[PDB]
Design an enzyme around this catalytic site. Structure first.
Site, short mmCIF file in Angstrom:
data_model
loop_
_atom_site.label_atom_id
_atom_site.label_comp_id
_atom_site.label_asym_id
_atom_site.label_seq_id
_atom_site.Cartn_x
_atom_site.Cartn_y
_atom_site.Cartn_z
CD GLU A 41 -40.82 -25.97 -18.68
OE1 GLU A 41 -42.03 -25.67 -18.59
OE2 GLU A 41 -40.02 -25.83 -17.73
CB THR A 73 -44.22 -36.66 -12.85
OG1 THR A 73 -43.09 -36.54 -11.97
CG2 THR A 73 -43.85 -37.54 -14.03
C1 BV0 Z 1 -51.61 -23.79 -20.81
C2 BV0 Z 1 -50.94 -25.15 -20.48
C3 BV0 Z 1 -51.34 -26.29 -21.11
C4 BV0 Z 1 -50.71 -27.52 -20.78
C5 BV0 Z 1 -49.68 -27.52 -19.80
N1 BV0 Z 1 -49.30 -26.37 -19.19
C6 BV0 Z 1 -48.28 -26.45 -18.23
O1 BV0 Z 1 -47.69 -27.65 -17.94
C7 BV0 Z 1 -47.86 -25.24 -17.57
C8 BV0 Z 1 -46.79 -25.25 -16.55
C9 BV0 Z 1 -46.45 -24.01 -15.97
C10 BV0 Z 1 -45.32 -23.96 -14.86
O2 BV0 Z 1 -44.67 -23.00 -14.70
N2 BV0 Z 1 -45.11 -25.14 -14.00
C11 BV0 Z 1 -44.10 -25.12 -12.94
C12 BV0 Z 1 -42.69 -25.29 -13.46
C13 BV0 Z 1 -41.63 -25.48 -12.57
C14 BV0 Z 1 -40.35 -25.62 -13.05
C15 BV0 Z 1 -40.14 -25.57 -14.48
N3 BV0 Z 1 -41.16 -25.39 -15.29
C16 BV0 Z 1 -42.40 -25.25 -14.85
C17 BV0 Z 1 -47.14 -22.81 -16.36
N4 BV0 Z 1 -46.79 -21.51 -15.74
N5 BV0 Z 1 -48.11 -22.86 -17.29
C18 BV0 Z 1 -48.83 -21.57 -17.68
C19 BV0 Z 1 -49.98 -21.33 -16.67
C20 BV0 Z 1 -49.81 -20.25 -16.07
C21 BV0 Z 1 -51.25 -19.68 -15.81
C22 BV0 Z 1 -52.17 -20.47 -16.71
O3 BV0 Z 1 -51.40 -21.19 -17.46
C23 BV0 Z 1 -48.48 -24.05 -17.90
N6 BV0 Z 1 -49.49 -24.06 -18.86
C24 BV0 Z 1 -49.86 -25.23 -19.47
#
Ligand code: BV0
Ligand code: BV0
Ligand code: BV0
EC number: 3.2.1.14
Lengths: 496, 497
Positions: free
Chosen positions: A142, A211
């Site tokens: 990602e 999504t």
């Molecule tokens: C800054 C940010 C900006 C734009 C998009 N962003 C994400 O789309 C995102 C996704 C995730 C995530 O894990 N989704 C579930 C998942 C499940 C399975 C595989 N991959 C992912 C994530 N932990 N963060 C950081 C979080 C943590 C605390 C604060 O910011 C993310 N941040 C961002």
């Protein structure tokens, strides 16, 4: 064709090293909670997460107790006794490991750099798969950037070649080894590799679109994180895809990528279908089994589309656990995420929440009037509309994160399976509403049209339509003496 | 550096074969009308037109009496006795021969296809030049399409090599043989080859922009055919350059090619300057010595920007010669084109015309109140602003079509020479007006900018500016963790000093 139902099984390393099926205080969601009934409702379980180490090979977390890890995986693969179609995949990556600022990011960039590195990485994927008994490989980087896409492609191609040979060697024609990725579900990250979607998806069985997370603390305006369709009252976003390195003309970019636009599930699906060579049957719609909570929201519209004071940092930079009633938020030390299981118990325990419904986005949300809280989440009702969308658009199925966030009865998973497979469920009259649809048109979803064959030597006026080389073309201005495709004057507007 | 003054001398085959300097009914504009004074005011005469035959070689019209052709050319090259800087070029092509539906179009496409065909065609160009005594080669292919451009360029390079060798062989270092082309002056035809302007112009001494015919009866709204700057009250046009195969992003195309836009001389010049590798000194501004007439003009516009009932179909599909006072229009049988000479003779013979001036476009036009007529043309006053534009923009000079349309005194040509070279002409205070300028920004005119250096590992907000690898970049959205140029998120907006 049975719709895919792909559920992530996520277990942190500490929980692997201390694995137990009789103490939810150590392991909240052991494999034993996946009953035979739930195993039959799944087609894939994505075990997560593995990583790419500094040796540029697929590998477990270096702190993993390998004996405990093998036992966990063996318990998952034992579920195949209840479902002969079930595959236990393993997932490499995730946000923590693979995002630009993640601990292991450089290993992903470097592993796909060269023919030698790609071959070595691809071999390690198959090795891990066979050594631990997995049924396929899922890659959750990602996300790869423009200059890294071609190497990413060749690595996927290399894994496909090795998996197909392994399928033949192991006599697995009835259940071939599979290759999937988690793909971006929003235009900003999608623009990194959007132009090469066709070559990305070619070696895959599925691309599982993420999504969800279409809203979060990183956005100043609260919103639904997985709206199916758009709400004109909600925020709109720059359409980053019009900046992808596609080589299209101004008219082609404009008609494909209206801007600003509503960041929705339908947008992500339609954006993929706009590209040539991306078949609908390989597109899988991700749904979240968790909600995203915001504090400091105003009143007047259930907490929707309001400013907020939710910290954006990672990890949560405080001990203020302000999601009233969220016991899991205290254990996980983060009030910004709540499983559907916890949200259901918060609705059932008199904490001041109201459950509201947005009939444009077709998604539920919680509002806490007394402490100004807003939660965007999905439930069995929103899944009715998303399941019908999957069927209407002939998508490959559904994916979700993650199994441990369903309630104890497995109601979310049971709902998805019911909407796809239950003989006594009938959504033929389900009203998909008047929310905003994504109206972009691209080369992969051009409408069928008829026009007179192009005639060399003819001078065409502005707006004339002709058929040529399998497409219908329209002139953008007058006095056109050139052939379609040889010029800047003709716009491809249809097919056949 | 003296500005180029390039005048076309056009003579049909019929007039060559019956050439005479004592019968304007047979030859209206013999070479004898180019006096020594006019010869000194020119730097180039483009003799026109030659063609490319089915043998894929430069050739005269097969119906040409070769002895009579040599005699006409000799009369032009004898003018060099009066002007040691004067060159008699010859032009290959023109609209009739080389347009997509023209009689010889296929010969142009086929001649540039292969190394052998290009070598054979290029050799024939230099052979014609030396055999008849010309001083250079001008190619007026209107216009090569995208797939033909690379062969077209390689053909120009081959001619360049042979001309440079011929210059040495003939000891002509003081007046080297030259190579020019006529280029499109409007975005529609320009879009065919716009992306490859740099490699097209590299082997040339000049590209002569045909910055006229930007309006005509084929347009539903009357307009100036050679407006210098834009008039917001006038019609606007689709900017075809945004559809060219440039590979730019949406933001880059939009910023370079505002649409709709004012189809003007300034637009064509600035559109050429937006491309890297196109030097201003090679750009020559074409001007018309003829006007275009409209009828049915209804308004208080002075007849400008009005609907009309002019045919604009070819050839003229009527015998209604409604351009009052245009006797040349009657003999030539077309009331929609008139030479400046005739337009002047219409103004001084009591026909009811008013000469009006548009201070935005800086061009004159005729209006006939009682019969509602509109004529767009250029004169000595509009040439003041175009000459100052040429000097301000450091262009190579001016080109015009054609010598036979000037008045008998050669006032239009004399004005151009005066505005460039006369010690007693002073345009330092000439006000270029408030007409619309073309403000598109591309790779060739990115401004110098300053910004903090990009820092790897930083997360940038929307609108942040950084310098990286020689450019200044701006983020198009927020939460940017990528490096500039590696992403869709960064827009090139400036250059680093
Ligand atoms: C800054 C940010 C900006 C734009 C998009 N962003 C994400 O789309 C995102 C996704 C995730 C995530 O894990 N989704 C579930 C998942 C499940 C399975 C595989 N991959 C992912 C994530 N932990 N963060 C950081 C979080 C943590 C605390 C604060 O910011 C993310 N941040 C961002
Ligand atoms: C510069 C120019 C000079 C002299 C004549 N000219 C025209 O007689 C003319 C007619 C038309 C036209 O559309 N006629 C109606 C029509 C439409 C479709 C089929 N048959 C007839 C036109 N668009 N242009 C502009 C150029 C720019 C790019 C290509 O065309 C025209 N230019 C010129
Ligand atoms: C039909 C047409 C359509 C679109 C564009 N067209 C021209 O751009 C055009 C140019 C010329 C021309 O000579 N410009 C000056 C010149 C000088 C030096 C080298 N090349 C060209 C022309 N004679 N016609 C024929 C037409 C005009 C009216 C009746 O017949 C032209 N027609 C058209």
């Amino acid at each position: 064709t049975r719709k895919a139902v792909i559920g992530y099984y996520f277990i942190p390393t500490n929980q692997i090293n201390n694995y137990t099926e009789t103490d939810t205080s150590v392991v909240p969601f052991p494999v034993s909670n996946i009953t035979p009934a739930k195993a039959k409702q799944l087609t894939h379980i994505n075990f997560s997460f593995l990583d790419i180490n500094s040796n540029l090979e697929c590998a477990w977390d270096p702190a993993t107790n390998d004996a405990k890890a093998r036992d966990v995986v063996n318990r998952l693969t034992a579920l195949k006794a209840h479902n002969p179609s079930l595959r236990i995949m393993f997932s490499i990556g995730g946000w923590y490991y693979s995002n630009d600022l993640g601990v292991s990011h450089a290993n992903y960039v470097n592993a796909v750099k060269t023919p030698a590195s790609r071959a070595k990485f691809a071999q390690s994927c198959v090795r891990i798969m066979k050594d631990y008994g997995f049924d396929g490989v899922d890659i959750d980087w990602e996300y790869p950037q423009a200059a890294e896409v071609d190497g990413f492609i060749a690595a996927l191609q290399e894994i496909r070649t090795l998996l197909n040979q392994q399928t033949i060697t192991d006599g697995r024609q009835a259940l071939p080894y599979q290759l999937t990725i988690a793909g971006a579900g929003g235009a900003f990250f999608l623009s990194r590799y959007y132009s090469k979607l066709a070559q990305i998806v070619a070696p895959l069985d599925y691309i599982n679109l993420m999504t969800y997370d279409l809203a979060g603390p990183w956005e100043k305006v609260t919103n639904h994180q997985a709206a199916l369709f758009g709400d004109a009252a909600g925020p709109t976003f720059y359409n980053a895809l019009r900046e992808a390195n596609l080589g299209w003309s101004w008219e082609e970019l404009t008609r494909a990528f209206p801007s600003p636009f509503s960041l929705t599930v339908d947008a992500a699906v339609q954006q993929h279908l706009m590209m040539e060579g991306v078949p609908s049957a390989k597109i899988v719609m991700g749904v979240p089994f968790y909600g995203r909570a915001f504090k400091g929201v105003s009143g007047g519209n259930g907490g929707q589309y309001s400013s907020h004071s939710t910290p954006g940092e990672d990890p949560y930079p405080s001990t203020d656990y302000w999601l009233v009633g969220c016991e899991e938020c205290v254990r996980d030390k983060d009030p910004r995420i709540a499983s559907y299981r916890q949200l259901e118990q918060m609705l059932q325990g008199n904490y001041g929440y109201q459950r509201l419904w947005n009939d444009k986005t077709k998604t539920p949300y919680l509002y806490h009037a007394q402490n100004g809280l807003f939660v965007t989440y999905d439930d069995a009702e929103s899944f009715k509309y998303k399941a019908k969308y999957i069927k209407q658009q002939q998508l490959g199925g559904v994916m979700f994160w993650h199994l441990g966030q369903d309630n104890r009865n497995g109601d979310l998973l049971a709902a998805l399976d019911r909407y796809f497979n239950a003989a006594d469920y009938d959504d033929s009259q389900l009203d998909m509403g008047t929310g905003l649809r994504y109206t972009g048109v691209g080369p992969g979803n051009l409408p069928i049209m008829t026009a007179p064959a192009y005639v060399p030597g003819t001078t065409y006026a502005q707006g004339a339509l002709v058929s040529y080389q399998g497409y219908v073309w329209q002139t953008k201005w007058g006095y056109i003496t050139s052939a379609p495709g040889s010029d800047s004057a003709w716009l491809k507007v249809g097919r056949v």
